[PDB]
Amino acid sequence: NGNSLSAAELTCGMIMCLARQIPQATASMKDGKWERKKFMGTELNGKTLGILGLGRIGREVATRMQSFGMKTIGYDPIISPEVSASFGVQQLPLEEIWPLCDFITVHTPLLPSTTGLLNDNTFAQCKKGVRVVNCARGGIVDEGALLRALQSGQCAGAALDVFTEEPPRDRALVDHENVISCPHLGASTKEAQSR
Amino acid sequence: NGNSLSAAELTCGMIMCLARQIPQATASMKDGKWERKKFMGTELNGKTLGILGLGRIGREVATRMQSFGMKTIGYDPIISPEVSASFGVQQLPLEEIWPLCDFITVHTPLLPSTTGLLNDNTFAQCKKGVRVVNCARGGIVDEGALLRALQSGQCAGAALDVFTEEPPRDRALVDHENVISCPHLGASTKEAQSR
Numbered sequence: 001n002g003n004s005l006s007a008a009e010l011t012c013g014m015i016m017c018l019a020r021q022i023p024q025a026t027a028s029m030k031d032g033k034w035e036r037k038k039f040m041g042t043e044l045n046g047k048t049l050g051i052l053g054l055g056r057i058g059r060e061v062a063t064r065m066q067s068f069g070m071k072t073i074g075y076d077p078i079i080s081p082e083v084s085a086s087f088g089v090q091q092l093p094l095e096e097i098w099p100l101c102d103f104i105t106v107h108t109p110l111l112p113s114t115t116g117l118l119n120d121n122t123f124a125q126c127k128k129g130v131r132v133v134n135c136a137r138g139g140i141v142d143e144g145a146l147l148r149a150l151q152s153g154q155c156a157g158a159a160l161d162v163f164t165e166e167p168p169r170d171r172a173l174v175d176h177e178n179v180i181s182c183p184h185l186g187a188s189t190k191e192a193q194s195r
Numbered sequence: 196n197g198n199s200l201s202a203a204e205l206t207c208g209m210i211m212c213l214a215r216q217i218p219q220a221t222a223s224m225k226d227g228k229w230e231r232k233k234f235m236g237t238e239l240n241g242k243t244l245g246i247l248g249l250g251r252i253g254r255e256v257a258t259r260m261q262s263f264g265m266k267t268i269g270y271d272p273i274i275s276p277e278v279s280a281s282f283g284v285q286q287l288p289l290e291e292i293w294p295l296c297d298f299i300t301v302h303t304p305l306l307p308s309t310t311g312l313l314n315d316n317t318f319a320q321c322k323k324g325v326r327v328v329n330c331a332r333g334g335i336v337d338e339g340a341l342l343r344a345l346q347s348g349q350c351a352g353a354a355l356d357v358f359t360e361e362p363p364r365d366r367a368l369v370d371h372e373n374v375i376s377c378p379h380l381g382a383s384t385k386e387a388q389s390r
């Protein structure tokens with residue numbers, strides 16, 4: 001609420017980091033390397049962003065990424081489609097969303113219906129090379145399914161602010177070259193902190 | 196032109212990386228650490244972005260960063276103030292720009308007038324803790340001045356895609372904890388490459 005914008009901002013940063021591998025490029029440069037072919041990236045403009053969860057945060061993400069020319073679709077069980085259309089988000093059933101997306105970001109509570117919202121079954125319906133962001137709650141993206149999708153290249157990259165366990169005790173996800181991460185910084189700004 | 200949007204998108208990513216230290220946070224996570232106090236960040240919304248150079252790329256950057264609620268000011272010796280106002284950028288003389296900016300981004304050619312555009316003189320007029328982005332041409336930002344401003348905290352962070360010498364032979368800048376960098380990736384997307 002108070003911290004809606006901090007969260008939305010971090011999310012949009014993670015989307016741009018996934019498109020251009022800025023974290024990985026900075027580590028490469030700090031190691032004295034100059035690796036230009038390795039960090040060939042993609043443009044956001046024209047790409048499709050799926051926003052799962054269309055409350056305050058998800059709406060803030062949408063309007064920000066619309067300015068980059070991304071197409072914004074999404075799903076929220078409770079938000080009427082008229083409301084989501086007011087902020088430029090086409091609502092579709094989940095089953096319609098998966099194959100359309102270049103990027104998927106989650107802005108849901110952690111409930112049994114959203115634990116593993118992204119899992120092996122939903123990864124398999126995604127377009128090959130989908131990129132995912134979770135700056136919401138640890139466990140929305142099933143971490144084992146995610147590593148499997150990174151290993152096969154079904155998922156081309158992920159950005160995680162949150163983990164099923166914090167700090168994350170299992171490191172294969174975090175240490176993967178196509179994964180960028182933060183220690184649950186979503187609400188960690190001076191402005192969110194100080195009202 | 197062809198690569199205007201690739202450049203503009205990398206620039207907006209660098210600004211978001213500066214605000215939230217995403218590259219530094221990922222490195223901290225990849226080193227097995229969980230450092231939440233260290234990576235306190237700031238919100239973009241309400242902050243001022245100075246844009247030096249108001250051609251295609253600078254204009255693209257402006258409209259994208261306007262969606263985050265940043266105030267966009269800037270300077271371009273050619274563009275009239277009524278025109279730049281038409282894409283939401285308030286023109287002011289440089290001397291006016293320096294004290295007002297939370298972030299400064301450069302989108303100029305490399306000419307005698309722009310080499311060391313940011314230097315010890317211009318850093319001293321900036322607000323304490325300014326963050327700077329160069330994704331245009333190496334040398335617009337004087338590198339020795341930049342390191343001095345990072346060491347003193349006059350500059351709170353910088354993001355560099357380009358260097359006076361490439362690859363950069365001198366590492367005190369690149370290795371600084373508040374500096375994020377890439378190996379001149381500005382035009383490096385599949386879409387810019389392939390017309």
Ligand SMILES: Cc1ccc(F)cc1C(=O)O
Binds near residue numbers: 054107108109113
């Ligand atoms: C409950 C729920 C299920 C599926 C989904 F995609 C989103 C939500 C939400 O809580 O916003």
Ligand SMILES: Cc1ccc(F)cc1C(=O)O
Binds near residue numbers: 247270302308309312
């Ligand atoms: C020539 C020039 C000088 C100062 C500056 F801020 C911008 C430019 C530009 O070429 O856009």
